[PDB]
Amino acid sequence: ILHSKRANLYYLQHCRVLVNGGRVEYVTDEGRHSHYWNIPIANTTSLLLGTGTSITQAAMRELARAGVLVGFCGGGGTPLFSANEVDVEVSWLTPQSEYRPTEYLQRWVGFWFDEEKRLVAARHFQRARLERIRHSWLEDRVLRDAGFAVDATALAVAVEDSARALEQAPNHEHLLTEEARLSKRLFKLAAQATRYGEFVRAKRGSGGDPANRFLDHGNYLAYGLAATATWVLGIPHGLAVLHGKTRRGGLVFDVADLIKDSLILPQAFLSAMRGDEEQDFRQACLDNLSRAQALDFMIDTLKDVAQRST
DNA sequence: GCAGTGAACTAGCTCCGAAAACCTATAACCGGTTGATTTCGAAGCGTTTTTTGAGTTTTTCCC
């Protein structure tokens, strides 16, 4: 249930959170034996209330006493609906509320306005993304066994070439387009491996074939996971690195990018070819995300870029 | 003047479709002959027509 070992983030489902006798208690079908009792309550913990759960104001009081962030997310924890805002660590605020302020916003803003540094960040994002493609498509054979048998030499050549291109070109405007070309080739490779036939990527949900729908669902979950990552870091969604400065919710899409083609896309084609239900697809996606430590990776990346930007 | 959307735009690509560019045979055209018949023309001024130009009014087309 520990959703991110890097963030001390826990997912609670099928239980009520209430305060009896001055201690926050979980009313669950397992009673005393539920693992929720092992939840450490400290300023380092952060909760994610899941499906079928409710919380009492008294609990909110006790958690605030202990300084524990709370957030509501849907099935499996991908769509993050609402959460507590996290503080910002600077010398002029200084409340004693015992809430672990986080300093990453200052680091982010310290460079966000300098375009050259912003570009350097974009490059760093894409380096990470490609290396996660090469990892999941080649190094690990779980997909191979599942049925996603694809050629390697063509994929390796394409990825090598795109990586070679990343280290070049002057502005965001090229990077976006280079990624788009890589995207197209990856789609073609996946369709060939899946024997799905010809594939064309419609957008704004105009597609009707299973592949398109499953891609949309997968991307929706990925966005939710990224939103969780940013919220844990406290960075507002508007300070995008690679998407346009006017794009509402740009940053989450920047962060979501580092898994779409690594983990969502193959599963979308696999499930479409296998003829799965939408529910089966959702469960498979969440299982893949859990297996890959996705949230932890996207946390590590954001921290790495912050430290590297100095 | 603002918040908002939709249109113009980005790189390089394979991949695909089309007009462009090139090769071939050969039928029509090129050159040579005779020579009595008809056709054409040397200057140039006046007449008549074209056809170019000149403007535009109207009509038609496309959106």
Short mmCIF file of all heavy atoms in Angstrom, two decimals, chain A residues 11 13-14 51 74-79 210 213-214 217-218 220-221 267 271-272 274-288:
data_model
loop_
_atom_site.label_atom_id
_atom_site.label_comp_id
_atom_site.label_asym_id
_atom_site.label_seq_id
_atom_site.Cartn_x
_atom_site.Cartn_y
_atom_site.Cartn_z
N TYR A 11 -1.85 4.68 0.45
CA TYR A 11 -3.15 4.62 -0.21
C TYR A 11 -4.12 3.84 0.67
O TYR A 11 -3.86 2.68 1.01
CB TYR A 11 -3.02 3.95 -1.58
CG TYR A 11 -4.31 3.90 -2.36
CD1 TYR A 11 -4.83 5.04 -2.93
CD2 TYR A 11 -4.98 2.71 -2.54
CE1 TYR A 11 -6.00 5.00 -3.66
CE2 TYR A 11 -6.16 2.65 -3.26
CZ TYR A 11 -6.66 3.80 -3.82
OH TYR A 11 -7.83 3.76 -4.54
N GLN A 13 -8.09 2.47 1.21
CA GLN A 13 -9.32 2.14 0.52
C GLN A 13 -10.19 1.26 1.40
O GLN A 13 -9.69 0.58 2.30
CB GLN A 13 -9.05 1.45 -0.82
CG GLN A 13 -8.37 0.10 -0.70
CD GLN A 13 -8.29 -0.61 -2.02
OE1 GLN A 13 -8.35 0.01 -3.08
NE2 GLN A 13 -8.15 -1.93 -1.98
N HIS A 14 -11.48 1.27 1.12
CA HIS A 14 -12.45 0.44 1.83
C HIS A 14 -12.29 0.58 3.35
O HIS A 14 -12.15 -0.40 4.07
CB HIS A 14 -12.29 -1.03 1.43
CG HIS A 14 -12.61 -1.30 -0.01
ND1 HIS A 14 -13.90 -1.31 -0.50
CD2 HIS A 14 -11.81 -1.58 -1.06
CE1 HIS A 14 -13.87 -1.59 -1.79
NE2 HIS A 14 -12.61 -1.75 -2.16
N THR A 51 -10.66 4.89 -3.04
CA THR A 51 -12.06 4.61 -3.30
C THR A 51 -12.75 4.10 -2.04
O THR A 51 -12.15 3.43 -1.20
CB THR A 51 -12.22 3.58 -4.41
OG1 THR A 51 -13.60 3.21 -4.52
CG2 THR A 51 -11.40 2.34 -4.12
N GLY A 74 -8.82 8.80 -6.83
CA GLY A 74 -9.71 7.75 -7.28
C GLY A 74 -9.05 6.39 -7.27
O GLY A 74 -7.97 6.19 -6.70
N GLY A 75 -9.71 5.44 -7.92
CA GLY A 75 -9.26 4.07 -7.94
C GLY A 75 -7.77 3.93 -8.19
O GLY A 75 -7.23 4.53 -9.12
N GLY A 76 -7.09 3.16 -7.35
CA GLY A 76 -5.68 2.90 -7.51
C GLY A 76 -4.78 4.08 -7.24
O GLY A 76 -3.56 3.89 -7.12
N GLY A 77 -5.32 5.29 -7.14
CA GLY A 77 -4.54 6.45 -6.79
C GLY A 77 -4.09 7.33 -7.93
O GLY A 77 -3.28 8.23 -7.71
N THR A 78 -4.58 7.10 -9.15
CA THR A 78 -4.10 7.90 -10.26
C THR A 78 -4.77 9.27 -10.32
O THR A 78 -4.07 10.29 -10.31
CB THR A 78 -4.26 7.14 -11.58
OG1 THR A 78 -5.56 6.55 -11.65
CG2 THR A 78 -3.21 6.06 -11.70
N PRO A 79 -6.10 9.37 -10.39
CA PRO A 79 -6.71 10.70 -10.51
C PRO A 79 -6.75 11.39 -9.15
O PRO A 79 -7.49 10.98 -8.25
CB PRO A 79 -8.12 10.39 -11.03
CG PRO A 79 -8.44 9.13 -10.34
CD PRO A 79 -7.14 8.35 -10.19
N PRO A 210 -10.27 0.49 -30.59
CA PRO A 210 -9.86 0.28 -29.19
C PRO A 210 -8.53 0.93 -28.84
O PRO A 210 -8.37 1.44 -27.72
CB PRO A 210 -9.78 -1.25 -29.08
CG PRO A 210 -10.66 -1.76 -30.16
CD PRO A 210 -10.50 -0.79 -31.29
N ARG A 213 -8.93 4.62 -27.71
CA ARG A 213 -9.59 4.76 -26.42
C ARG A 213 -8.65 4.36 -25.29
O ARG A 213 -8.56 5.05 -24.26
CB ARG A 213 -10.86 3.93 -26.38
CG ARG A 213 -11.86 4.29 -27.46
CD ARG A 213 -12.78 5.41 -27.01
NE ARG A 213 -14.01 4.90 -26.42
CZ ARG A 213 -15.16 5.56 -26.38
NH1 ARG A 213 -15.28 6.78 -26.88
NH2 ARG A 213 -16.21 4.99 -25.81
N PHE A 214 -7.97 3.23 -25.45
CA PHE A 214 -7.06 2.78 -24.40
C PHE A 214 -5.91 3.75 -24.22
O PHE A 214 -5.45 3.98 -23.10
CB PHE A 214 -6.54 1.38 -24.72
CG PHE A 214 -7.59 0.31 -24.67
CD1 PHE A 214 -7.28 -1.00 -24.99
CD2 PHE A 214 -8.89 0.60 -24.30
CE1 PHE A 214 -8.23 -1.98 -24.95
CE2 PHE A 214 -9.85 -0.38 -24.26
CZ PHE A 214 -9.52 -1.68 -24.58
N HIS A 217 -7.34 6.62 -22.05
CA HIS A 217 -7.42 6.22 -20.64
C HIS A 217 -6.04 6.17 -20.00
O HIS A 217 -5.82 6.68 -18.90
CB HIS A 217 -8.11 4.87 -20.52
CG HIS A 217 -8.94 4.72 -19.28
ND1 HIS A 217 -10.25 5.16 -19.20
CD2 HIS A 217 -8.65 4.20 -18.07
CE1 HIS A 217 -10.72 4.90 -18.00
NE2 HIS A 217 -9.77 4.33 -17.29
N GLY A 218 -5.08 5.52 -20.68
CA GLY A 218 -3.74 5.44 -20.14
C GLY A 218 -3.13 6.80 -19.88
O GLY A 218 -2.54 7.04 -18.83
N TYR A 220 -4.75 9.55 -19.35
CA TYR A 220 -5.47 10.17 -18.24
C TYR A 220 -4.89 9.73 -16.90
O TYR A 220 -4.61 10.55 -16.02
CB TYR A 220 -6.95 9.82 -18.35
CG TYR A 220 -7.80 10.28 -17.20
CD1 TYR A 220 -8.25 11.58 -17.13
CD2 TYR A 220 -8.18 9.41 -16.20
CE1 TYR A 220 -9.04 12.01 -16.09
CE2 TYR A 220 -8.97 9.82 -15.16
CZ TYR A 220 -9.40 11.13 -15.11
OH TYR A 220 -10.19 11.54 -14.06
N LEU A 221 -4.62 8.43 -16.77
CA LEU A 221 -4.01 7.93 -15.54
C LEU A 221 -2.62 8.51 -15.36
O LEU A 221 -2.22 8.86 -14.23
CB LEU A 221 -3.96 6.41 -15.54
CG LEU A 221 -5.29 5.69 -15.75
CD1 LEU A 221 -5.08 4.43 -16.54
CD2 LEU A 221 -5.95 5.38 -14.44
N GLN A 267 1.08 -1.14 -23.34
CA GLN A 267 -0.05 -1.78 -22.71
C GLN A 267 -1.34 -1.48 -23.46
O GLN A 267 -2.22 -2.33 -23.55
CB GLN A 267 -0.17 -1.34 -21.25
CG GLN A 267 -1.15 -2.17 -20.45
CD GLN A 267 -0.71 -3.61 -20.31
OE1 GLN A 267 0.41 -3.89 -19.89
NE2 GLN A 267 -1.58 -4.53 -20.69
N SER A 271 -3.47 -4.62 -24.75
CA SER A 271 -4.83 -4.86 -24.29
C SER A 271 -5.81 -4.77 -25.44
O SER A 271 -6.78 -5.54 -25.50
CB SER A 271 -5.19 -3.86 -23.19
OG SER A 271 -4.12 -3.72 -22.27
N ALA A 272 -5.60 -3.83 -26.37
CA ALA A 272 -6.50 -3.74 -27.51
C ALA A 272 -6.48 -5.03 -28.32
O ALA A 272 -7.53 -5.55 -28.71
CB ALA A 272 -6.12 -2.54 -28.37
N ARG A 274 -5.50 -8.01 -27.33
CA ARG A 274 -6.01 -9.08 -26.49
C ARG A 274 -7.52 -9.02 -26.34
O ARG A 274 -8.13 -10.01 -25.90
CB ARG A 274 -5.35 -9.02 -25.12
CG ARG A 274 -5.45 -10.30 -24.31
CD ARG A 274 -5.18 -10.04 -22.84
NE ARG A 274 -3.76 -9.84 -22.55
CZ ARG A 274 -3.29 -8.99 -21.65
NH1 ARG A 274 -4.09 -8.22 -20.93
NH2 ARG A 274 -1.97 -8.90 -21.46
N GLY A 275 -8.14 -7.89 -26.68
CA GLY A 275 -9.58 -7.77 -26.55
C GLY A 275 -10.08 -7.56 -25.14
O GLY A 275 -11.19 -7.99 -24.82
N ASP A 276 -9.30 -6.91 -24.29
CA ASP A 276 -9.66 -6.78 -22.89
C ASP A 276 -10.80 -5.78 -22.70
O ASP A 276 -11.13 -4.98 -23.58
CB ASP A 276 -8.46 -6.32 -22.07
CG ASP A 276 -7.46 -7.43 -21.83
OD1 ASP A 276 -7.84 -8.61 -21.97
OD2 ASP A 276 -6.29 -7.12 -21.50
N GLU A 277 -11.42 -5.86 -21.53
CA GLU A 277 -12.36 -4.85 -21.09
C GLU A 277 -11.62 -3.57 -20.73
O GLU A 277 -10.41 -3.57 -20.48
CB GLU A 277 -13.15 -5.34 -19.88
CG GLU A 277 -14.20 -6.41 -20.16
CD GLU A 277 -15.00 -6.13 -21.41
OE1 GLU A 277 -15.31 -4.95 -21.67
OE2 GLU A 277 -15.34 -7.10 -22.13
N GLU A 278 -12.36 -2.46 -20.67
CA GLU A 278 -11.76 -1.23 -20.19
C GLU A 278 -11.28 -1.40 -18.75
O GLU A 278 -10.18 -0.95 -18.40
CB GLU A 278 -12.75 -0.06 -20.29
CG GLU A 278 -13.99 -0.16 -19.41
CD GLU A 278 -14.98 -1.18 -19.92
OE1 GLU A 278 -14.77 -1.72 -21.03
OE2 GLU A 278 -15.98 -1.44 -19.22
N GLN A 279 -12.08 -2.05 -17.91
CA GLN A 279 -11.67 -2.27 -16.53
C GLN A 279 -10.38 -3.07 -16.47
O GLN A 279 -9.48 -2.76 -15.67
CB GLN A 279 -12.78 -2.97 -15.76
CG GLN A 279 -12.54 -3.06 -14.27
CD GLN A 279 -12.32 -1.70 -13.64
OE1 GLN A 279 -12.75 -0.68 -14.18
NE2 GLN A 279 -11.65 -1.68 -12.50
N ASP A 280 -10.28 -4.11 -17.29
CA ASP A 280 -9.05 -4.90 -17.32
C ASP A 280 -7.87 -4.03 -17.74
O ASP A 280 -6.78 -4.14 -17.17
CB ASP A 280 -9.20 -6.08 -18.27
CG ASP A 280 -9.62 -7.35 -17.56
OD1 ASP A 280 -9.79 -7.32 -16.32
OD2 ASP A 280 -9.77 -8.39 -18.23
N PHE A 281 -8.07 -3.17 -18.73
CA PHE A 281 -7.01 -2.27 -19.14
C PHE A 281 -6.56 -1.39 -17.99
O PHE A 281 -5.36 -1.21 -17.75
CB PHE A 281 -7.47 -1.41 -20.31
CG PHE A 281 -6.46 -0.39 -20.74
CD1 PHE A 281 -5.24 -0.79 -21.24
CD2 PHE A 281 -6.73 0.96 -20.65
CE1 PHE A 281 -4.31 0.13 -21.64
CE2 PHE A 281 -5.80 1.89 -21.04
CZ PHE A 281 -4.59 1.48 -21.54
N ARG A 282 -7.51 -0.78 -17.29
CA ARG A 282 -7.18 0.09 -16.17
C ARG A 282 -6.36 -0.67 -15.13
O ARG A 282 -5.32 -0.18 -14.67
CB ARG A 282 -8.46 0.64 -15.55
CG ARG A 282 -8.24 1.82 -14.63
CD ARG A 282 -9.56 2.34 -14.10
NE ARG A 282 -9.46 3.72 -13.65
CZ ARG A 282 -8.87 4.10 -12.53
NH1 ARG A 282 -8.33 3.21 -11.70
NH2 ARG A 282 -8.82 5.39 -12.22
N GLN A 283 -6.81 -1.86 -14.76
CA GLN A 283 -6.08 -2.64 -13.77
C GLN A 283 -4.68 -2.97 -14.25
O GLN A 283 -3.71 -2.89 -13.49
CB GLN A 283 -6.85 -3.91 -13.43
CG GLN A 283 -6.08 -4.91 -12.59
CD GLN A 283 -5.34 -4.25 -11.45
OE1 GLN A 283 -5.88 -3.36 -10.78
NE2 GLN A 283 -4.11 -4.67 -11.21
N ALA A 284 -4.55 -3.33 -15.53
CA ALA A 284 -3.23 -3.65 -16.07
C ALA A 284 -2.32 -2.43 -16.02
O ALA A 284 -1.14 -2.55 -15.66
CB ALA A 284 -3.36 -4.16 -17.50
N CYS A 285 -2.83 -1.27 -16.42
CA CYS A 285 -2.02 -0.06 -16.38
C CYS A 285 -1.52 0.20 -14.98
O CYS A 285 -0.33 0.49 -14.77
CB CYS A 285 -2.83 1.13 -16.88
SG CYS A 285 -3.19 1.09 -18.64
N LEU A 286 -2.42 0.18 -14.00
CA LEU A 286 -2.00 0.44 -12.63
C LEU A 286 -0.96 -0.57 -12.18
O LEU A 286 0.00 -0.21 -11.49
CB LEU A 286 -3.21 0.42 -11.70
CG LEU A 286 -4.31 1.41 -12.08
CD1 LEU A 286 -5.52 1.21 -11.20
CD2 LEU A 286 -3.81 2.83 -11.97
N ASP A 287 -1.14 -1.84 -12.55
CA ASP A 287 -0.13 -2.84 -12.21
C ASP A 287 1.22 -2.50 -12.83
O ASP A 287 2.26 -2.62 -12.17
CB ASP A 287 -0.60 -4.22 -12.67
CG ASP A 287 0.20 -5.34 -12.04
OD1 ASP A 287 1.25 -5.05 -11.44
OD2 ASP A 287 -0.22 -6.51 -12.16
N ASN A 288 1.22 -2.08 -14.09
CA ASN A 288 2.47 -1.70 -14.73
C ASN A 288 3.12 -0.52 -14.02
O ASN A 288 4.32 -0.51 -13.76
CB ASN A 288 2.22 -1.36 -16.20
CG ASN A 288 2.26 -2.59 -17.09
OD1 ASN A 288 3.33 -3.09 -17.42
ND2 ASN A 288 1.09 -3.07 -17.48
#
